[PDB]
Design a protein around this nucleic acid. Structure first.
Lengths: 50, 154, 98
DNA sequence: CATGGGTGCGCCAGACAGGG
DNA sequence: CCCTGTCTGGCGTCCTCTCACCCCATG
């Protein structure tokens, strides 16, 4: 829902879900591109922490 | 012999990280310890001394290397090496299509109001680089001309 | 350069079809050269009607044919957008050559 | 325009080492 | 293995009434 002004005051769960989906899309694209080992380890580790 | 390594930067300031890295090299004049810098990850041709490691992590807006450990970080294990050289040539001489079209062959439209629609190419024109395909719009087939890139092969 | 050919038989049903597609294009694209017709097309066939004799009973029927071409002037990304899966004329063959 | 990353609390309690 | 020290977690009163302010930043 927005506030008086009009800027949408967004919830925290939307930040969390949007982070997980951004990272998951990045990880699918790197497994498409066949990135090396350390890149996809950091990518999966960032998804795990997300 | 200089081997490759992977550097993590603040994603978005990556060109400025690359420029500041080249400038820190030419400041602290370890010119014989750095080969290139390739562009959120920055590829660095390098050798491993602890002095050069402190140099790259003292470059601003750089988090650190990405490897097995932080004592002896890991040379980027790029499976594609000579294949990555051919992949750079693939991106360079971009493999493009002129008029991918065939009679009675179904195609796919993903551009213009006809996007998200399929149809068949009754006629093809490689010289004019145009495919004659009609779309089943409101039942009646709508023969329209679409480019090879404007439509996908089905 | 963009052609909208319309192919049917009668001029008494295509006459509302040339009205619906110039005006709905006017509200969205407003870019059209106007309907330019084509010569009326005739398919006459004399056929024998007596069941086993008499080569004199030849009755003339015809499947009549008409063609009208709209020819919008500019490739508009609003005329085609609103009039893609849309055609008032029923039992008609539309040819939106883009 | 859209995305991308301090240093003043105190007790209980059980799990994890650490001697013992 | 039997006791001893450490290391992290889990927790701390209820209703109300205003106020002020909520992501830069930028090629």
């Amino acid at each position: 829902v927005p506030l008086d002004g009009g800027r949408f005051a967004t919830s925290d769960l939307n930040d969390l879900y949007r982070r997980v989906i951004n990272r998951n899309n990045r990880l699918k694209r790197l497994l498409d591109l066949a990135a090396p080992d350390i890149i996809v380890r950091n990518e999966k580790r960032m998804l795990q922490e997300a | 012999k200089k081997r490759w390594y992977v550097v993590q930067a603040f994603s978005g300031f990556e060109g400025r990280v690359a420029t500041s890295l080249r400038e820190h090299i030419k400041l602290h004049n370890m010119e014989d310890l750095f080969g290139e810098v390739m562009v959120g990850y920055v590829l660095v041709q390098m050798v491993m001394n602890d002095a050069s490691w402190h140099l790259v992590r003292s470059v601003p807006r750089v988090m650190g290397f990405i490897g097995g450990t932080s004592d002896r970080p890991a040379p980027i294990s790029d499976k594609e090496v000579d294949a990555i050289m051919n992949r750079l040539q693939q991106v360079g001489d971009k493999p493009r299509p002129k008029t991918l079209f065939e009679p009675g062959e179904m195609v796919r439209v993903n551009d213009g109001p006809f996007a998200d629609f399929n149809g068949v190419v009754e006629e093809v024109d490689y010289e004019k680089s145009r495919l004659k395909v009609s779309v089943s719009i409101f039942g009646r087939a709508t023969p329209v001309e679409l480019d090879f890139s404007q439509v996908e092969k089905a | 350069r963009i052609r909208i050919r319309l192919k049917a038989f009668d001029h008494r049903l295509i006459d509302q079809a040339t009205a619906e597609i110039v005006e709905t294009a006017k509200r969205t694209g407003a870019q059209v050269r106007g309907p330019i017709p084509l010569p009326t097309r005739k398919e006459r066939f004399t056929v024998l009607i007596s069941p086993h004799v008499n080569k004199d009973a030849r009755d003339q029927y015809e499947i009549r044919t008409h063609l009208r071409l709209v020819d919008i002037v500019e490739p508009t990304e609003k005329t085609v957008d609103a009039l893609m899966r849309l055609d008032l004329a029923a039992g008609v063959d539309v040819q939106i050559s883009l």
